[PDB]
mmCIF file of C-alpha atoms and ligand atoms in Angstrom:
data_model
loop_
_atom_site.group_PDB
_atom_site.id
_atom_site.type_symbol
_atom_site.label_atom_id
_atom_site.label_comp_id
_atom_site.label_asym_id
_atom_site.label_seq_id
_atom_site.Cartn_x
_atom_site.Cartn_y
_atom_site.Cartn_z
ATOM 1 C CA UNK A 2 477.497 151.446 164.915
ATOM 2 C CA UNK A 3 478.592 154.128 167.102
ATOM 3 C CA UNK A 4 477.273 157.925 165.998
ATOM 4 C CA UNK A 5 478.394 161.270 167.682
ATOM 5 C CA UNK A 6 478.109 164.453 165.093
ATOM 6 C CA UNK A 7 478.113 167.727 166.148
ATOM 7 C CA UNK A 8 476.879 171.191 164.279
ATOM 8 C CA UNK A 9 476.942 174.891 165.641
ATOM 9 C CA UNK A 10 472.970 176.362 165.458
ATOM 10 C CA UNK A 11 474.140 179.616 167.355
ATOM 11 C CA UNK A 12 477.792 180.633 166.711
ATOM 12 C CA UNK A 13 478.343 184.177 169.417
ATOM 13 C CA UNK A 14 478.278 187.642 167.247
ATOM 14 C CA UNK A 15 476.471 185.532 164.223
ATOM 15 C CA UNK A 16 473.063 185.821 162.840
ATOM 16 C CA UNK A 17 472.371 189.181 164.651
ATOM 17 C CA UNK A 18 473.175 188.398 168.094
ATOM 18 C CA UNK A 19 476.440 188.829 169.966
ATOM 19 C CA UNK A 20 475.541 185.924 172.140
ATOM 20 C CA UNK A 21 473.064 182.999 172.408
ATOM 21 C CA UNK A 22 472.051 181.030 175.263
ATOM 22 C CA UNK A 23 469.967 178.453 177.456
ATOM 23 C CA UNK A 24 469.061 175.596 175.091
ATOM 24 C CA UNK A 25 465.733 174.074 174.154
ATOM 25 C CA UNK A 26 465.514 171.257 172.097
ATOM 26 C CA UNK A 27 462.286 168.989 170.813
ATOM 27 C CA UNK A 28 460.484 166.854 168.145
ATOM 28 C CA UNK A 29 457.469 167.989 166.993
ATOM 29 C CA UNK A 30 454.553 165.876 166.426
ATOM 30 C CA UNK A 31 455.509 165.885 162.574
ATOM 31 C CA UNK A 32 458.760 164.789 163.666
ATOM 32 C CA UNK A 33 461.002 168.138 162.709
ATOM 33 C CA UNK A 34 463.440 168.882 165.451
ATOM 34 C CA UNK A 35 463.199 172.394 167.138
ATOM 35 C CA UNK A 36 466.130 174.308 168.764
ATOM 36 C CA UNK A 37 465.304 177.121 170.597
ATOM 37 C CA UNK A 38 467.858 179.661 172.786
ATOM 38 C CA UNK A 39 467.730 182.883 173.675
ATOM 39 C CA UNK A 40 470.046 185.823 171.620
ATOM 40 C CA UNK A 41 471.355 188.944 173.954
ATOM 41 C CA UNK A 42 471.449 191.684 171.057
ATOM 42 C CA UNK A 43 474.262 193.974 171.426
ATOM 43 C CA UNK A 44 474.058 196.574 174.533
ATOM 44 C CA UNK A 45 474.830 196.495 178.234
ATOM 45 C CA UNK A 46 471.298 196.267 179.673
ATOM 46 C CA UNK A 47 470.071 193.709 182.105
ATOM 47 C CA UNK A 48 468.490 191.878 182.031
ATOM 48 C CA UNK A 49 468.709 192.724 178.277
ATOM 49 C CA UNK A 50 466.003 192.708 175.599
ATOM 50 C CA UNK A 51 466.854 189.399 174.762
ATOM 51 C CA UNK A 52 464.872 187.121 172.418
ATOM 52 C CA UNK A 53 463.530 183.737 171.923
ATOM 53 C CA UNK A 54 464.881 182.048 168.298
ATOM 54 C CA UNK A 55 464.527 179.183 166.986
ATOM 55 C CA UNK A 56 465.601 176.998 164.453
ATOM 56 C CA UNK A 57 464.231 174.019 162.916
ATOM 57 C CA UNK A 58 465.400 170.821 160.936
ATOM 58 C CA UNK A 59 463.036 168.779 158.479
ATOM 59 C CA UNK A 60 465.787 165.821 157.888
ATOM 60 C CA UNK A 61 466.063 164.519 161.723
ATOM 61 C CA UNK A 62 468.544 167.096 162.460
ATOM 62 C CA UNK A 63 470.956 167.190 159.186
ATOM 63 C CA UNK A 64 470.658 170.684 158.032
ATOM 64 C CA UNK A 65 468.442 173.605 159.598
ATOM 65 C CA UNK A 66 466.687 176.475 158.537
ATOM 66 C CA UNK A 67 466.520 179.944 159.059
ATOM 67 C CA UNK A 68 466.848 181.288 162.634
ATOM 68 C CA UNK A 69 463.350 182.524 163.462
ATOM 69 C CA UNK A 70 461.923 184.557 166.552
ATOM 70 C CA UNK A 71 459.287 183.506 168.682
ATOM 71 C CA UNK A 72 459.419 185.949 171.295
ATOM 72 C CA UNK A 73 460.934 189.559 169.953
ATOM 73 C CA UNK A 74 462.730 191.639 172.990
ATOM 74 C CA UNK A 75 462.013 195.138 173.119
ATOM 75 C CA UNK A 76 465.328 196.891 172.788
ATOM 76 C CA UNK A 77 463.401 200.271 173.461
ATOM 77 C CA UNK A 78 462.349 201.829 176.686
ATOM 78 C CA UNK A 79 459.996 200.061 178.125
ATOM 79 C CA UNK A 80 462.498 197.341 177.693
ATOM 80 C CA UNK A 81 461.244 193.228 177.512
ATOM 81 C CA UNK A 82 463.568 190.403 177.452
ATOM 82 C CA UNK A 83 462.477 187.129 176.675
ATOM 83 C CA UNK A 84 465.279 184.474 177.869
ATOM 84 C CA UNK A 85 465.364 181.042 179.024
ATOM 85 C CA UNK A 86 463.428 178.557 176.606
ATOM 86 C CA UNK A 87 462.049 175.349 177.688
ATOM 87 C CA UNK A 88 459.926 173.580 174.904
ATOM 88 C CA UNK A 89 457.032 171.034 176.391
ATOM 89 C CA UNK A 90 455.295 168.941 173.529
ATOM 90 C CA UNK A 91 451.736 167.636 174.156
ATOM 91 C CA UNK A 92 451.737 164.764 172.187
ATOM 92 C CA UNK A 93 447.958 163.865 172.843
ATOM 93 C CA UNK A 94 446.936 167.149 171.158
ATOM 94 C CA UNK A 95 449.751 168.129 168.594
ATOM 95 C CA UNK A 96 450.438 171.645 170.743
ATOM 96 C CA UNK A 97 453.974 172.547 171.245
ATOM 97 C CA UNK A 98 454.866 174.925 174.528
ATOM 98 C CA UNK A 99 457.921 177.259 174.742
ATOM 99 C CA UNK A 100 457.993 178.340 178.219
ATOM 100 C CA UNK A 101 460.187 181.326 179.003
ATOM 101 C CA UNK A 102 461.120 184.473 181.409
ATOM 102 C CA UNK A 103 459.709 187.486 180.504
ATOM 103 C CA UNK A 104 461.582 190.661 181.892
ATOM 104 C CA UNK A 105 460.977 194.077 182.279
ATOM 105 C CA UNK A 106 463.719 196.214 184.605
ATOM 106 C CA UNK A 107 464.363 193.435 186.978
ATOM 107 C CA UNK A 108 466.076 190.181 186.558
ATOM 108 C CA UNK A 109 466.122 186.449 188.800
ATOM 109 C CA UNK A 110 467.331 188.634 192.053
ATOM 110 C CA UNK A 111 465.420 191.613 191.434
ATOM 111 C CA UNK A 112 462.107 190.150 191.280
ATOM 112 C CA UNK A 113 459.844 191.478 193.855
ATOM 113 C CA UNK A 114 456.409 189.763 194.789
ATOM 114 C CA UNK A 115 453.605 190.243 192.291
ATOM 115 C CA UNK A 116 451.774 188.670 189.095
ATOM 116 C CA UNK A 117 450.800 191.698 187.289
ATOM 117 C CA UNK A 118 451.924 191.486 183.956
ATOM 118 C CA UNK A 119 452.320 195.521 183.857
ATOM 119 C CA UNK A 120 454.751 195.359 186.980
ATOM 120 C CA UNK A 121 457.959 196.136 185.101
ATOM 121 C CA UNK A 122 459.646 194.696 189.013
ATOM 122 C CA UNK A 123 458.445 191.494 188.623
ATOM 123 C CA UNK A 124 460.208 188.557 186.687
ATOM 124 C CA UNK A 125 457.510 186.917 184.477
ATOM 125 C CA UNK A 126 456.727 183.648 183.630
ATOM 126 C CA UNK A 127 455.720 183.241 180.017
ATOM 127 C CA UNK A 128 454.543 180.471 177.919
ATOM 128 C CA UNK A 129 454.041 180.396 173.956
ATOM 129 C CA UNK A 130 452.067 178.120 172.733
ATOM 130 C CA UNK A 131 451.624 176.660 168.690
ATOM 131 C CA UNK A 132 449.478 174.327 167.227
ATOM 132 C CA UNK A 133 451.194 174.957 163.703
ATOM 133 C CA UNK A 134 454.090 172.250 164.974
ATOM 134 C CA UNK A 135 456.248 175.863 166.412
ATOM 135 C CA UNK A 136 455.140 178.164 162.881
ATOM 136 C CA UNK A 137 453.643 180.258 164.828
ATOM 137 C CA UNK A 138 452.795 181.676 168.459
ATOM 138 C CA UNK A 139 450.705 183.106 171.085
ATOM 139 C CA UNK A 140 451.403 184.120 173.628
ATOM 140 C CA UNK A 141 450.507 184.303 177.670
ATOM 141 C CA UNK A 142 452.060 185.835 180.910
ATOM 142 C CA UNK A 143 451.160 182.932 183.326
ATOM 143 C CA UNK A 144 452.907 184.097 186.392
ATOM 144 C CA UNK A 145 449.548 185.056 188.433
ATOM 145 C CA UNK A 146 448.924 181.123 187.538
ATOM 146 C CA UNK A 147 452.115 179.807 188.931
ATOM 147 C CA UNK A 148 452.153 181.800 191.873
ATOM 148 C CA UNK A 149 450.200 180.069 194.439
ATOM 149 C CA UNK A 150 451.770 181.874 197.415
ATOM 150 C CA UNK A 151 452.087 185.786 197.010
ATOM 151 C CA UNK A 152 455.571 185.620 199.152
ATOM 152 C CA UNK A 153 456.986 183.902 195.847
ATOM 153 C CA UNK A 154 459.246 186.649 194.647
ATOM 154 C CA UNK A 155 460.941 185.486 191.390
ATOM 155 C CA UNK A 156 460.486 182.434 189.059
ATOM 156 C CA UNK A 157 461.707 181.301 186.315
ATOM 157 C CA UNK A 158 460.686 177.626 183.861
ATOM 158 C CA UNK A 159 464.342 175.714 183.404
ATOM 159 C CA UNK A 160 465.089 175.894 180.491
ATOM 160 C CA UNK A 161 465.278 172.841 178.055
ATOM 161 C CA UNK A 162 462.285 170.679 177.880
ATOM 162 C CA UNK A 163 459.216 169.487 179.751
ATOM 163 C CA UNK A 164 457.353 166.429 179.806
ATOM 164 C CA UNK A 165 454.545 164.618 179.595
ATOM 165 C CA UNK A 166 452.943 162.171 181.768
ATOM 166 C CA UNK A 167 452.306 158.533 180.103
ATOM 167 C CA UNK A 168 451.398 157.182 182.841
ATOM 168 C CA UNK A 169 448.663 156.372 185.937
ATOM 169 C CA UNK A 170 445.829 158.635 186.792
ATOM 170 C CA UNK A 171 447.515 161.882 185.398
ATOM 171 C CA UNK A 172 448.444 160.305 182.062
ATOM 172 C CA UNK A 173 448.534 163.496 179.588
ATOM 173 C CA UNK A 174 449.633 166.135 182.341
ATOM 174 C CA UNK A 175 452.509 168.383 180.834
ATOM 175 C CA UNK A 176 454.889 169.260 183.162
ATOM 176 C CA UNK A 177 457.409 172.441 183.227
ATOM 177 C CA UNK A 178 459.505 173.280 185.983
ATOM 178 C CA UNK A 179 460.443 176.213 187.655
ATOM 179 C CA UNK A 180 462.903 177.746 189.914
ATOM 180 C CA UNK A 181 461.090 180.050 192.430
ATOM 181 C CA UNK A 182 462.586 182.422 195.466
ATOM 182 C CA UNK A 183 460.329 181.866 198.157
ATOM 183 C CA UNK A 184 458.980 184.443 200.736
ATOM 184 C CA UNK A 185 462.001 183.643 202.861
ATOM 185 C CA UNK A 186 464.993 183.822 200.522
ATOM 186 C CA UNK A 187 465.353 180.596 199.738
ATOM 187 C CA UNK A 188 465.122 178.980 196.256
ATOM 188 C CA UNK A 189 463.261 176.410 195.781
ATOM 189 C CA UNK A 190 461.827 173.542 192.772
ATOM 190 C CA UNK A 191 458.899 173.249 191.708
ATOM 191 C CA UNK A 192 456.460 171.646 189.039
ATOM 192 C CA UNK A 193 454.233 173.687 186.855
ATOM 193 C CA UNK A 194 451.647 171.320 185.522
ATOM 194 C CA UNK A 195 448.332 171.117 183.325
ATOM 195 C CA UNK A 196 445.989 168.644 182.790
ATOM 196 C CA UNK A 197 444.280 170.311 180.101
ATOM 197 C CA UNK A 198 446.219 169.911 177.471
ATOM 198 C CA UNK A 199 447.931 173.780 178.342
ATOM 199 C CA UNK A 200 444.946 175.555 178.856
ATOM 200 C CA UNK A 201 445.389 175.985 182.339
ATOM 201 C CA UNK A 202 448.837 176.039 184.227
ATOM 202 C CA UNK A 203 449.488 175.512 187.947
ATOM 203 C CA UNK A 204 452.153 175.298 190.304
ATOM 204 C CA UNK A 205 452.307 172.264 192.713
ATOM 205 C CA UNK A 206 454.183 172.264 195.942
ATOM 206 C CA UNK A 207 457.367 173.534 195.901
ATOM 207 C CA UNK A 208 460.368 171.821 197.484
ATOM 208 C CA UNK A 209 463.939 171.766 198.493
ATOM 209 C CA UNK A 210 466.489 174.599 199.850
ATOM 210 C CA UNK A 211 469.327 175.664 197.801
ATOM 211 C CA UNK A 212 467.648 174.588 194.741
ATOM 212 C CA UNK A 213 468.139 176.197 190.954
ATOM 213 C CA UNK A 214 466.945 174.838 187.641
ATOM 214 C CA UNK A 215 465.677 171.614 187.605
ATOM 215 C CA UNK A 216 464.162 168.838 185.259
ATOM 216 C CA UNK A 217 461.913 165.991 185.697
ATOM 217 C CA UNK A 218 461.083 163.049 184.140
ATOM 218 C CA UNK A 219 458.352 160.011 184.335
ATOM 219 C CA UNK A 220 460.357 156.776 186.019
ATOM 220 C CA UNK A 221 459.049 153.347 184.829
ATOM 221 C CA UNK A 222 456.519 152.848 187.800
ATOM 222 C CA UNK A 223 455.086 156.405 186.560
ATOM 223 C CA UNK A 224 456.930 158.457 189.907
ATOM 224 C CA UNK A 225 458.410 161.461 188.834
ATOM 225 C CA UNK A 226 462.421 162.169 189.783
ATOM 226 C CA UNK A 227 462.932 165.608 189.822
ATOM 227 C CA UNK A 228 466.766 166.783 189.490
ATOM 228 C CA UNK A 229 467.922 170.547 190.374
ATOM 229 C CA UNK A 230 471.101 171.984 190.554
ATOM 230 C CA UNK A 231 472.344 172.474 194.012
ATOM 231 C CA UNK A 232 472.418 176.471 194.605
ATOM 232 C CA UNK A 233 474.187 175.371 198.303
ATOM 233 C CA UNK A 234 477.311 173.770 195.683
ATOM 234 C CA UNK A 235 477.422 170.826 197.191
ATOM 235 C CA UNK A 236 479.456 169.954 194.208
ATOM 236 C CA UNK A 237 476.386 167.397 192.674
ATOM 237 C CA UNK A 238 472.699 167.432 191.631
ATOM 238 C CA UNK A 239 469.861 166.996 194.085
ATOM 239 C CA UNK A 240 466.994 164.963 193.543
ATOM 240 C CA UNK A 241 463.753 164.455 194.890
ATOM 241 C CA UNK A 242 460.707 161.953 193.857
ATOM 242 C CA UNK A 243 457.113 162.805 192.971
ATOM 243 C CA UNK A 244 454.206 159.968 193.788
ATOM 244 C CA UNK A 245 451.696 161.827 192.662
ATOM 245 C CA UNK A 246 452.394 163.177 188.901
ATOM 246 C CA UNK A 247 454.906 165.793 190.011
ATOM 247 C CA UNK A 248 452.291 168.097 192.199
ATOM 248 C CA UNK A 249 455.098 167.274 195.126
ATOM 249 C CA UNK A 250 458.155 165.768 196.405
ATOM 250 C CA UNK A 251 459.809 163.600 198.771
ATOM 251 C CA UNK A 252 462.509 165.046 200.734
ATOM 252 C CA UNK A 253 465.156 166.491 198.288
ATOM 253 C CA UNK A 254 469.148 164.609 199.061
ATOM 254 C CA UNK A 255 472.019 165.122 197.089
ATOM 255 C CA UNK A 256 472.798 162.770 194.573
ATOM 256 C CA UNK A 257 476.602 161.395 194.572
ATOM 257 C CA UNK A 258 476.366 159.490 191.107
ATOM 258 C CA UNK A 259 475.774 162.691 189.557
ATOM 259 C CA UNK A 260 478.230 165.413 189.959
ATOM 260 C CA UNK A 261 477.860 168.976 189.315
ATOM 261 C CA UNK A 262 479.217 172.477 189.622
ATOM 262 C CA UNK A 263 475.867 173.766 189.711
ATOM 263 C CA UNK A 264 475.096 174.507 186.666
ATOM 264 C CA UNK A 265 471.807 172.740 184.166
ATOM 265 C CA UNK A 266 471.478 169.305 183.197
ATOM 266 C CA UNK A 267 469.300 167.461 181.701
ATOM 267 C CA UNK A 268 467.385 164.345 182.301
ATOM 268 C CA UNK A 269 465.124 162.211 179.576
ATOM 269 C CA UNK A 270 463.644 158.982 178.989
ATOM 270 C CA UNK A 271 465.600 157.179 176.377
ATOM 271 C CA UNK A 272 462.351 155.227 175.674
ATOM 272 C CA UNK A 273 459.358 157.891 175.945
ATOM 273 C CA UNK A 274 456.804 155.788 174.479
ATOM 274 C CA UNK A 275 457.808 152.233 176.063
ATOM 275 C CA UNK A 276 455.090 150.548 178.387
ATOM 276 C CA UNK A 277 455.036 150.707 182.201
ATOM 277 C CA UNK A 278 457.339 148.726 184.088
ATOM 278 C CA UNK A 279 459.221 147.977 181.540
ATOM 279 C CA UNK A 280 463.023 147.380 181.036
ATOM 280 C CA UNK A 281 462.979 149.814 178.706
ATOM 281 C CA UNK A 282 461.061 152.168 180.545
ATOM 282 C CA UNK A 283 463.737 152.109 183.350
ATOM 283 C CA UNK A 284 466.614 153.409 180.942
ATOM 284 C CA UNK A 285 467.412 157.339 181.742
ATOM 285 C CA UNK A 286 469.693 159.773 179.934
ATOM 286 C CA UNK A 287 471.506 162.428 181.694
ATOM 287 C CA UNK A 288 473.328 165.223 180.414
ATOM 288 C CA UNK A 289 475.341 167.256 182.398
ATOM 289 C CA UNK A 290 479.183 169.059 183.527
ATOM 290 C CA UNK A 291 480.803 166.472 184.955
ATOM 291 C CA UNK A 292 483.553 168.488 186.681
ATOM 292 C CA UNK A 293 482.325 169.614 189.904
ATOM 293 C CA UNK A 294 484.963 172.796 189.744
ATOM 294 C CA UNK A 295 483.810 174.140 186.715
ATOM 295 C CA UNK A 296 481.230 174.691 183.595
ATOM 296 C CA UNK A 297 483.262 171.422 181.443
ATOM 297 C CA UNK A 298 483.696 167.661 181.025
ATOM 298 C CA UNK A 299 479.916 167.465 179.381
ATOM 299 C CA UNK A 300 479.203 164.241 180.120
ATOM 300 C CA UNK A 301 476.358 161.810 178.667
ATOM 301 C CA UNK A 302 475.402 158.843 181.714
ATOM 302 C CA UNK A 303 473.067 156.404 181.265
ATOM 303 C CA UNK A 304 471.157 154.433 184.153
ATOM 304 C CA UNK A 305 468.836 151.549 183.278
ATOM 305 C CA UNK A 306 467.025 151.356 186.962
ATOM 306 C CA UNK A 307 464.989 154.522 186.692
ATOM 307 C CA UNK A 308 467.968 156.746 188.163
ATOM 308 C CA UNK A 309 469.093 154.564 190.655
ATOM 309 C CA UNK A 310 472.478 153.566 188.951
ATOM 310 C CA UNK A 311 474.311 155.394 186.602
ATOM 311 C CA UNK A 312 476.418 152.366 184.870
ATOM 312 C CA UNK A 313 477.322 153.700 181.650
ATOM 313 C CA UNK A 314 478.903 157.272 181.136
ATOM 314 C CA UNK A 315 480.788 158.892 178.615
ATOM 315 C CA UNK A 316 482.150 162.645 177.734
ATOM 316 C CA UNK A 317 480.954 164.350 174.905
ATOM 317 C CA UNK A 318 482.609 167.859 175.485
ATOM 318 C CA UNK A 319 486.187 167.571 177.474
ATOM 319 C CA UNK A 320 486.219 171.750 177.159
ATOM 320 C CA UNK A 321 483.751 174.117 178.233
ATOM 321 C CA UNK A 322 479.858 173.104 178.385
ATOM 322 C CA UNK A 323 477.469 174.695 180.205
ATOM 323 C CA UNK A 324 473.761 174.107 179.741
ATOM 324 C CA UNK A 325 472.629 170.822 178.263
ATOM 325 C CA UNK A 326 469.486 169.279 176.596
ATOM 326 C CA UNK A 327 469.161 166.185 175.449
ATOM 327 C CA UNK A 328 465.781 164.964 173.265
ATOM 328 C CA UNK A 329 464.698 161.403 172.030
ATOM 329 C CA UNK A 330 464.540 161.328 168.351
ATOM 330 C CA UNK A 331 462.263 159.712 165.928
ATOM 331 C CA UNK A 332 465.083 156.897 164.666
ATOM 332 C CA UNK A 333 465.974 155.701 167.842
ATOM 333 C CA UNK A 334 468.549 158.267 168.500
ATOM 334 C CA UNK A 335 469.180 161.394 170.667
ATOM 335 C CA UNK A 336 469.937 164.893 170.067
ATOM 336 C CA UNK A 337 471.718 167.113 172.261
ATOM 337 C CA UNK A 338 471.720 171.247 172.540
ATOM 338 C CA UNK A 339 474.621 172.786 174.296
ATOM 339 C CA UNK A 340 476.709 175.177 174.975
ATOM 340 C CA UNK A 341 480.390 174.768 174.225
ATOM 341 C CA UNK A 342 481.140 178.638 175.013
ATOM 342 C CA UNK A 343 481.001 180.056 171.750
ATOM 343 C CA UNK A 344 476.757 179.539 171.415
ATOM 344 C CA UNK A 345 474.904 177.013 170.722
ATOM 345 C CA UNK A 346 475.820 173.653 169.611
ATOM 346 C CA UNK A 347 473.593 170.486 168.615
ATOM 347 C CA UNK A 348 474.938 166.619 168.659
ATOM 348 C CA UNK A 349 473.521 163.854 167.788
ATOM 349 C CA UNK A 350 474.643 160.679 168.921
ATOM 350 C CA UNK A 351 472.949 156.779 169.712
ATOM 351 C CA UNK A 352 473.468 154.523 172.794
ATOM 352 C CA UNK A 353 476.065 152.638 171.389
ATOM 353 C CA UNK A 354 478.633 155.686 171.389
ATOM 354 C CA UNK A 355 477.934 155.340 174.855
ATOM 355 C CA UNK A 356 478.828 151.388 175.268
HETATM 356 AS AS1 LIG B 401 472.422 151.191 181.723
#
């Protein structure tokens, strides 16, 4: 019964891009999986002109086609990067988001205040949107959206995937989140949401010190457990919990079931669609580096109390992994985009090669 297989999308200095990075995986409504990453063409500029690819499979993740750009860096003066995917799916409406940075001369530290899409100093926020099922694209800077407080210097959306809400009164929100600096330095998590089906974005309340990337994910009572990397290293994840549909957070604590080096993780349902409150509904995936020294030991845990307990775990990658997305898949199964070192690498594998 067990399955684990594994395929290269991205191999490093293949397919017109010396390196690929910061994986995005989904199902689309028609049920074709998307990988996304960003390619760093060949120069020394940063951040570079990098741009957003993507590849898709048609047989549940078997074979994939061509390696296609959504979002095409400008490797000319005035450079553009585009970096960082996260994919969000709106599965009441069909429209698939890929949410990534958009930069001009100034990277995650560089970032100065502002929302201006012009201002080459600021690090943008961008968001793609397709109602072809990820054919095609448009395209919106959505930073002046997202930036509720004009101290927020830099942002970026994690990248991997979003969600959407199933759930209680904001059943259908879509939910992206972001890293932000904050007007005093500090980094912080925080949910981008809409509740129109992507035609408006907003930030809710950001939280937490020493935050970095972060996911969320709908818990079986409809709360929302939000889980960053720890920028202070405490050496696992933090976590915080949303009553309200992710708009804010408790207080943020460090989570010891979950070690980390500080690096991205992911965190899913492993039962999107199954009713409130139930056992199913409790069961989380989490992928992640286990090793709390460095980027390796990718590790696949399972908890079947909406994050409280982590009973099951089991390593996928003993070498080098970095970032990590796991999605649900159509036959019951779950795919995984990573980063082994040399690109970008999808698995596939079903709960019982976890045991
Ligand atoms: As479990």
């Amino acid at each position: 019964e067990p399955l684990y297989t594994e395929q290269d999308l991205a191999v490093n200095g293949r397919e017109g891009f010396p390196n690929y990075s910061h994986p995005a995986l989904t199902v689309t409504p028609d049920g074709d999986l998307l990988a996304s990453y960003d390619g760093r063409p060949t120069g020394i500029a940063a951040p570079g002109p990098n741009s957003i690819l993507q590849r898709r499979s048609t047989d549940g993740g078997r074979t994939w086609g061509e390696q296609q750009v959504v979002s095409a860096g400008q490797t000319t003066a005035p450079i553009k990067g585009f970096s960082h995917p996260s994919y969000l799916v709106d599965r009441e409406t069909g429209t698939i988001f890929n949410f990534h940075v958009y930069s001009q001369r100034q990277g995650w530290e560089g970032s100065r205040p502002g929302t201006d899409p012009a201002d080459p100093n600021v690090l943008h926020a961008n968001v793609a949107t397709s109602t072809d099922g990820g054919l095609t694209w448009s395209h919106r800077t959505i930073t002046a959206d997202i930036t509720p407080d004009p101290g927020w210097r830099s942002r970026f959306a994690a990248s991997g995937e979003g969600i959407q809400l199933r759930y209680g009164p904001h059943a259908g929100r879509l939910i992206q989140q972001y890293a932000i600096i904050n007007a005093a330095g500090a980094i912080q998590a925080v949910s981008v949401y809409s509740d129109d089906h992507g035609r408006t974005w907003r930030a809710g309340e950001a939280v937490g010190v020493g935050m970095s990337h972060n996911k969320t994910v709908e818990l079986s009572d409809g709360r929302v457990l939000l889980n960053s990397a720890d920028s202070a290293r405490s050496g696992y994840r933090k976590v915080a919990v949303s009553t309200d549909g992710g708009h804010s957070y408790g207080p943020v604590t460090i989570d010891r079931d979950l070690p980390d080096p500080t690096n991205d993780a992911s965190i899913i349902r492993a039962f999107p669609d199954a009713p409130a409150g139930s056992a199913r509904a409790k069961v989380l995936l989490f992928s992640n580096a286990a090793s709390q020294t460095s980027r390796s030991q990718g590790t696949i845990r399972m908890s079947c109390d909406d994050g409280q307990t982590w009973p099951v775990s089991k390593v996928f990658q003993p070498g080098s992994m970095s970032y990590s997305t796991l999605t649900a898949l159509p036959d019951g199964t779950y795919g995984l985009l990573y980063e082994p070192g040399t690109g970008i690498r999808y698995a596939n594998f079903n709960l019982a090669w976890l045991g």
